[PDB]
Design a protein around this ligand. Sequence first.
Ligand SMILES: Nc1nc2c(ncn2[C@@H]2O[C@H](COP(=O)(O)OP(=O)(O)O)[C@@H](O)[C@H]2O)c(=O)[nH]1
Ligand SMILES: [Mg+2]
Length: 166
Amino acid sequence: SKEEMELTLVGLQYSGKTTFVNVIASGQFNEDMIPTVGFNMRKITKGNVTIKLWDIGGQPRFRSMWERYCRGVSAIVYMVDAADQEKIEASKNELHNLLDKPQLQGIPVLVLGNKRDLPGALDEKELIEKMNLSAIQDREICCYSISCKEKDNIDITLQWLIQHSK
Ligand SMILES: Nc1nc2c(ncn2[C@@H]2O[C@H](COP(=O)(O)OP(=O)(O)O)[C@@H](O)[C@H]2O)c(=O)[nH]1
Ligand SMILES: [Mg+2]
């Protein structure tokens, strides 16, 4: 039977949001940076499942809107550059800040430690520890190390998403 789900994709700028959307939509990786925009809604169909994906700007100027775009969705995907050690603390802070918002209560969160292909990229345990993901207790939370460039764990990411297609 047909399913329709909505996902919101947030995380700091340069974490890989737009790249990830394109890998999910087409299977193709882009090395180039598409310019950053406040929002972009795309519909991606995977067989019987239609995914309405909100790709949300991660620059400081867009972050106050993250909550509004996350409201009512099937799952929040939180993109992290697992290779950019300097930005992990800010990435962490924005995640926990976002999940303080009561209208987001209970919505499943998938944290993606992107750029696994790069030297020094954090794995699941390392990202879970550095981002204090164990502290997130009101909802289902999952973390995967992925590479949009080499495809590692794109399959399981999509599987996780479909399992939350409602
Ligand atoms: N090495 C590597 N680079 C990636 C990967 N995913 C995205 N990128 C690159 O990281 C940069 C930022 O990606 P982008 O999708 O524009 O990030 P966004 O600001 O979160 O939308 C781009 O140059 C992408 O090519 C990955 O898995 N590995
Ligand atoms: Mg982008």
